[PDB]
Design an enzyme around this catalytic site. Structure first.
Site, PDB file in Angstrom:
ATOM      1  N   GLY C   8       4.703  -6.645   0.650  1.00  0.00           N
ATOM      2  CA  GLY C   8       3.629  -5.855   0.206  1.00  0.00           C
ATOM      3  C   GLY C   8       3.207  -6.286  -1.092  1.00  0.00           C
ATOM      4  O   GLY C   8       2.962  -5.535  -2.065  1.00  0.00           O
ATOM      5  N   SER C  10       0.434  -7.788  -1.640  1.00  0.00           N
ATOM      6  CA  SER C  10      -1.040  -7.914  -1.547  1.00  0.00           C
ATOM      7  C   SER C  10      -1.750  -6.908  -2.434  1.00  0.00           C
ATOM      8  O   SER C  10      -2.994  -6.957  -2.904  1.00  0.00           O
ATOM      9  CB  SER C  10      -1.655  -7.939  -0.204  1.00  0.00           C
ATOM     10  OG  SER C  10      -1.052  -6.774   0.311  1.00  0.00           O
ATOM     11  N   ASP C  59       4.867  -8.281   9.970  1.00  0.00           N
ATOM     12  CA  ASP C  59       4.711  -7.018   9.959  1.00  0.00           C
ATOM     13  C   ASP C  59       6.385  -6.844   9.939  1.00  0.00           C
ATOM     14  O   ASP C  59       6.936  -7.091  10.781  1.00  0.00           O
ATOM     15  CB  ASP C  59       4.152  -6.640  11.549  1.00  0.00           C
ATOM     16  CG  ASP C  59       4.375  -5.144  11.776  1.00  0.00           C
ATOM     17  OD1 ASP C  59       5.049  -4.221  11.047  1.00  0.00           O
ATOM     18  OD2 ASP C  59       3.776  -4.675  12.931  1.00  0.00           O
ATOM     19  N   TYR C 152       9.048  10.533   5.428  1.00  0.00           N
ATOM     20  CA  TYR C 152       9.193   9.489   4.277  1.00  0.00           C
ATOM     21  C   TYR C 152      10.470   9.916   3.615  1.00  0.00           C
ATOM     22  O   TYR C 152      11.275   8.792   3.199  1.00  0.00           O
ATOM     23  CB  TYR C 152       7.962   9.498   3.410  1.00  0.00           C
ATOM     24  CG  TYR C 152       7.593   8.799   2.241  1.00  0.00           C
ATOM     25  CD1 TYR C 152       7.189   7.480   2.449  1.00  0.00           C
ATOM     26  CD2 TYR C 152       8.132   9.146   1.053  1.00  0.00           C
ATOM     27  CE1 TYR C 152       7.043   6.800   1.491  1.00  0.00           C
ATOM     28  CE2 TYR C 152       7.944   8.181   0.094  1.00  0.00           C
ATOM     29  CZ  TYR C 152       7.343   7.030   0.242  1.00  0.00           C
ATOM     30  OH  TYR C 152       7.122   6.130  -0.770  1.00  0.00           O
TER      31      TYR C 152
HETATM   32  N1  LIG Z   1       2.655   4.452  -5.339  1.00  0.00           N
HETATM   33  C1  LIG Z   1       3.843   5.524  -5.626  1.00  0.00           C
HETATM   34  O1  LIG Z   1       3.359   6.550  -5.553  1.00  0.00           O
HETATM   35  C2  LIG Z   1       5.062   5.287  -4.799  1.00  0.00           C
HETATM   36  C3  LIG Z   1       5.988   6.284  -5.189  1.00  0.00           C
HETATM   37  C4  LIG Z   1       7.306   5.923  -4.722  1.00  0.00           C
HETATM   38  C5  LIG Z   1       7.448   4.745  -3.841  1.00  0.00           C
HETATM   39  N2  LIG Z   1       6.522   3.967  -3.617  1.00  0.00           N
HETATM   40  C6  LIG Z   1       7.105   2.917  -2.701  1.00  0.00           C
HETATM   41  O2  LIG Z   1       6.447   1.550  -3.422  1.00  0.00           O
HETATM   42  C7  LIG Z   1       6.194   0.849  -2.242  1.00  0.00           C
HETATM   43  C8  LIG Z   1       4.946   0.006  -2.640  1.00  0.00           C
HETATM   44  O3  LIG Z   1       3.901   1.008  -2.882  1.00  0.00           O
HETATM   45  P1  LIG Z   1       2.541   0.927  -3.148  1.00  0.00           P
HETATM   46  O4  LIG Z   1       1.914   2.161  -3.561  1.00  0.00           O
HETATM   47  O5  LIG Z   1       2.090  -0.402  -3.983  1.00  0.00           O
HETATM   48  O6  LIG Z   1       1.843   0.748  -1.696  1.00  0.00           O
HETATM   49  P2  LIG Z   1       0.310   0.075  -1.197  1.00  0.00           P
HETATM   50  O7  LIG Z   1      -0.219  -0.175  -2.577  1.00  0.00           O
HETATM   51  O8  LIG Z   1      -0.180   1.163  -0.232  1.00  0.00           O
HETATM   52  O9  LIG Z   1       0.637  -0.966  -0.483  1.00  0.00           O
HETATM   53  C9  LIG Z   1       1.403  -1.157   0.710  1.00  0.00           C
HETATM   54  C10 LIG Z   1       1.808  -2.665   0.879  1.00  0.00           C
HETATM   55  O10 LIG Z   1       2.837  -2.738   2.075  1.00  0.00           O
HETATM   56  C11 LIG Z   1       2.256  -3.753   2.978  1.00  0.00           C
HETATM   57  N3  LIG Z   1       2.726  -2.857   4.030  1.00  0.00           N
HETATM   58  C12 LIG Z   1       2.357  -1.921   4.689  1.00  0.00           C
HETATM   59  N4  LIG Z   1       2.635  -1.666   5.941  1.00  0.00           N
HETATM   60  C13 LIG Z   1       3.152  -3.043   6.420  1.00  0.00           C
HETATM   61  C14 LIG Z   1       3.898  -3.567   7.520  1.00  0.00           C
HETATM   62  N5  LIG Z   1       3.987  -2.605   8.677  1.00  0.00           N
HETATM   63  N6  LIG Z   1       4.339  -4.595   7.625  1.00  0.00           N
HETATM   64  C15 LIG Z   1       4.213  -5.367   6.458  1.00  0.00           C
HETATM   65  N7  LIG Z   1       3.784  -5.012   5.176  1.00  0.00           N
HETATM   66  C16 LIG Z   1       3.268  -3.827   5.160  1.00  0.00           C
HETATM   67  C17 LIG Z   1       0.672  -3.706   2.729  1.00  0.00           C
HETATM   68  O11 LIG Z   1       0.224  -4.868   3.265  1.00  0.00           O
HETATM   69  P3  LIG Z   1      -1.165  -5.269   3.425  1.00  0.00           P
HETATM   70  O12 LIG Z   1      -2.024  -4.999   2.168  1.00  0.00           O
HETATM   71  O13 LIG Z   1      -1.095  -6.707   3.746  1.00  0.00           O
HETATM   72  O14 LIG Z   1      -1.642  -4.013   4.614  1.00  0.00           O
HETATM   73  C18 LIG Z   1       0.917  -3.420   1.060  1.00  0.00           C
HETATM   74  O15 LIG Z   1       0.955  -4.764   0.488  1.00  0.00           O
HETATM   75  C19 LIG Z   1       6.240   1.477  -1.092  1.00  0.00           C
HETATM   76  O16 LIG Z   1       7.589   0.917  -0.245  1.00  0.00           O
HETATM   77  C20 LIG Z   1       6.233   2.877  -1.342  1.00  0.00           C
HETATM   78  O17 LIG Z   1       7.005   3.753  -0.421  1.00  0.00           O
HETATM   79  C21 LIG Z   1       5.521   4.233  -3.854  1.00  0.00           C
END
Ligand SMILES: NC(=O)c1ccc[n+]([C@@H]2O[C@H](COP(=O)([O-])OP(=O)(O)OC[C@H]3O[C@@H](n4cnc5c(N)ncnc54)[C@H](OP(=O)(O)O)[C@@H]3O)[C@@H](O)[C@H]2O)c1
Ligand SMILES: NC(=O)c1ccc[n+]([C@@H]2O[C@H](COP(=O)([O-])OP(=O)(O)OC[C@H]3O[C@@H](n4cnc5c(N)ncnc54)[C@H](OP(=O)(O)O)[C@@H]3O)[C@@H](O)[C@H]2O)c1
Ligand SMILES: NC(=O)c1ccc[n+]([C@@H]2O[C@H](COP(=O)([O-])OP(=O)(O)OC[C@H]3O[C@@H](n4cnc5c(N)ncnc54)[C@H](OP(=O)(O)O)[C@@H]3O)[C@@H](O)[C@H]2O)c1
Ligand SMILES: NC(=O)c1ccc[n+]([C@@H]2O[C@H](COP(=O)([O-])OP(=O)(O)OC[C@H]3O[C@@H](n4cnc5c(N)ncnc54)[C@H](OP(=O)(O)O)[C@@H]3O)[C@@H](O)[C@H]2O)c1
Lengths: 238, 242, 242, 242
Positions: C8, C10, C59, C152
């Site tokens: 992730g 990107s 994926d 989740y």
């Molecule tokens: N933001 C928050 O508030 C928060 C809080 C607690 C925990 N987290 C955790 O932090 C991590 C990253 O969060 P974020 O907020 O940066 O998320 P995000 O910006 O929504 O980005 C999601 C990332 O995961 C990749 N992804 C999604 N589905 C996928 C799949 N089926 N296979 C492979 N890659 C996949 C996406 O790839 P593409 O861009 O190629 O689609 C993207 O790079 C997550 O695990 C999330 O649960 C976030």
């Protein structure tokens, strides 16, 4: 029969616990500090409902008095089977405004009481070879911390660590040692109460009788494999 | 009266929980997967000691079957007051040697069962307005992790998170949601070489396994009316392991 | 040099972690699922600032595709030193309204990814004898539960249990395994009505969201050589939520 | 131009933390109780490596001395940016054999020090408007309990509760408050017969003690600007003990 000392049995949670354990068939050491009337009222309800107990008194912050009274009680009546270290106080204030007494009274009363009250009961409990139960009263603010109570949070967290360490020492002796951490129970600052409520998913306070049910469970013979735990009764706060 | 579904009631902890809750006066849904004999033996003991129950059956990994059987049971007998989601399995192996089936069978059975079994029971529980009890079975290895069981540890920790999240949603409905995390309990699930047993004991201050009846005592407490302010908790029954 | 796969990468936290670890001198496997442009943008910034990396894609819910791509990458470039299993998604809804896809997509993507992504990297990591780092992304809702996200919460708690169990298996191999549990971080993942944002803030003592770069600083610490005695931990970065 | 008080800087973890934070560019209050030579040795190494500090001294169990010295230091040099409340002791014995002094010396020194040392620093920290860092030293035995140390476990757990409560009060002031809980670290504090060392190792998955420098790396991370969203945490550095 089997006796259980309950500190702070003159009111609130201690009273409720005393009543419940008496009903469960335990002979209750109904302890009080200054409220001898409350203590007698508690014992009256115990006797009325067909159970047994007796009054005793000490300041849990007073090490020597605790040792005096407890050694005497044990000599006259035998070892306690159970100890419920329930007595405690709060002296809230923001950390920088906290007076020496605010800090010391809370640490000496809530935390030093573990040593002062429980130490004199241990060897006799072991000597009697009936196993045993030790239950301490901490608090949700001991688990998560709470603004305005760095002192209370500290003492209550310290009780948790004491409880766990003791649980390990006494496990082979069939004495369980656990801690109950209530949330908000109906027995402070209206501002802090509001904030506390914001965190209770059940949107209500607990009742003392509820805390007593848990104590009852832990005291019971079927709970002999539960030790070294903090069990929170708090409406879902955490 | 008030009915409580107990999954994996054909043996071990589920059997013990079924017996105890029956004695407490609950009408028991004695569930089994394949061991129908065990299930009947459990129900026989319940009836012999003056309580009520009935058999039912489903694969907790089978979402559709769970929904079919539970909707039917609820239509015929009314909403469950309690659900004890006890059924589960282990497929141990070091992480790099863990097969696809080892991983999937444990995740689908132990964790997906939360959704598969408990979801169909919720609205009916709410509709009946009696409040309720939901109790899940995790494990010490779900709390602390355990070598040789990355899959089991994951599923069992996931149950903890599910339980806690649900506890928050259902608190205002007077339904408590808690999780029991046993340590080492003496059942058929545990098959251990004397060498490994000794090592396991070295980590239990009480130097003994728990009995299924002990786990059932805790379930009994949580099911009881006096435990209505306990929700969102994992309670460990493990001889002092942690 | 030492390479670190970041899933992730990107966008969001993954992108931030990639940038920071690149700056620390690690060669970055900049992974993406579908957003190849974002991935290239992340790699461009890495190269511009004097670091190295390369794109790869899969994926994380697709076990076979993960194994295929990772075996190939490892054959060509050698074992990863680090793995940051960051990718994940949310499909929120109240438990009784939660669809099959809501449940399965979250469990398969967030939790099965542990097995799918990390398993193929372990023996090679061991074989290379450089030690290693494994870092998973959980969430405050995996630690405490959160209403509207039983799915989740379950997946994220399961990641914690997996992490801990693995940490024990790999400790003697000088590979640490830890989990970062962010609170509310400002990324595309979070889409919130101003009303719900205010409420969320009421529960954060610091009264602000975290930045992705902040989560990256913790990853950086955990990846560093001085953090070799920290393993089996969940470390929360959440403005004081708990 | 940001100063950090480090108690128990004359040796062990405190020395290591002093060195590391000096290298990070902090001006160090190198505190000692009785070992002035150790303290000067610590400051010499700081200066040799291009950093700044100064000695100061007090008994953390002596409230009035702590207040006197700290008010004086703050009047002369300005508010501390950081406080690392590291000093502590152990007086082990089985609970029933524990003397009054064994109990009091440990509670007064390890727990009352939170109030004694940190209280005088808070308003000045707030007044300087630079934000800040507070870091306390607990222990794995504060988290889990440890046989032979009911007193130490109690004090060390109390430090955790203090830390967390303070973290909530000071969050809006951009001062983080965190606790480090080390496992077994190789210093003068640990004095163990080879037999007991072996047993202790049996409980550490990494099968080694930590080094003081490792504890210092974590302090360093927490002191850093990028760690401003981490507050109210206990972070364990213990080789995987839990
Ligand atoms: N933001 C928050 O508030 C928060 C809080 C607690 C925990 N987290 C955790 O932090 C991590 C990253 O969060 P974020 O907020 O940066 O998320 P995000 O910006 O929504 O980005 C999601 C990332 O995961 C990749 N992804 C999604 N589905 C996928 C799949 N089926 N296979 C492979 N890659 C996949 C996406 O790839 P593409 O861009 O190629 O689609 C993207 O790079 C997550 O695990 C999330 O649960 C976030
Ligand atoms: N209420 C809550 O929300 C809540 C929440 C979490 C934890 N708790 C904890 O649970 C316990 C009981 O709470 P509660 O609400 O029942 O308190 P309460 O109603 O205020 O009663 C406190 C009791 O402690 C006794 N006490 C005070 N100073 C003492 C001393 N120096 N030595 C011995 N005993 C002393 C009092 O004695 P006399 O009146 O007999 O003189 C009284 O019986 C406390 O430890 C408290 O910290 C309460
Ligand atoms: N024993 C322990 O040390 C221990 C420790 C921690 C947690 N636990 C947990 O406690 C629970 C009960 O364990 P136990 O020792 O009582 O195990 P057990 O004696 O092996 O009982 C297994 C039960 O789960 C049922 N089951 C298995 N797969 C199923 C499926 N696909 N669908 C529906 N039901 C299924 C079985 O049904 P049939 O027999 O009808 O096939 C049986 O009643 C489990 O969730 C386990 O993870 C056990
Ligand atoms: N070592 C471990 O395995 C371990 C594990 C977990 C936690 N910890 C904690 O880490 C911290 C540092 O431990 P360490 O192993 O570096 O201990 P250490 O080598 O024993 O160093 C102790 C330091 O604390 C100071 N100190 C002791 N009593 C004092 C008092 N009354 N007033 C002021 N200062 C006092 C000493 O001052 P002087 O020497 O100048 O008298 C010394 O600088 C302690 O809080 C300890 O409990 C240690």
């Amino acid at each position: 029969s089997r006796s259980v000392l309950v500190t702070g049995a003159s009111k609130g949670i201690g009273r409720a616990i005393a009543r419940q354990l008496a009903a469960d068939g335990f002979n209750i050491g109904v302890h009080y500090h200054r409220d001898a009337a409350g203590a007698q009222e508690t014992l009256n309800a115990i006797v009325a409902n067909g159970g047994n107990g007796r009054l005793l008194s000490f300041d849990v912050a007073n090490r020597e008095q605790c040792r005096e009274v407890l050694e005497h009680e044990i000599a006259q009546h035998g070892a306690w089977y159970g100890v419920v270290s329930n007595a405690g106080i709060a002296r809230d204030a923001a950390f920088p405004a906290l007076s020496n007494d605010d800090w010391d009274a809370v640490i000496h009363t809530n935390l030093d009481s573990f040593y002062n009250v429980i130490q004199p009961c241990i060897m006799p409990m072991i000597g009697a070879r009936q196993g045993g139960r030790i239950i301490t009263l901490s608090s949700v603010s001991g688990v998560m911390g709470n603004r305005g109570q760095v002192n209370y949070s500290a003492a209550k967290a310290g009780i948790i660590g004491a409880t766990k360490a003791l649980a390990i020492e006494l496990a082979k002796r069939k004495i369980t040692v656990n801690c109950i951490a209530p949330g908000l129970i109906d027995t402070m600052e209206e501002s802090a109460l509001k904030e506390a409520m914001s965190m209770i998913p059940m949107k209500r306070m607990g009742q003392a009788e509820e805390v007593a049910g848990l104590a009852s469970y832990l005291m019971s013979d079927i709970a002999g494999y539960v030790t070294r735990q903090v069990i929170s009764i708090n409406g879902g706060m955490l």
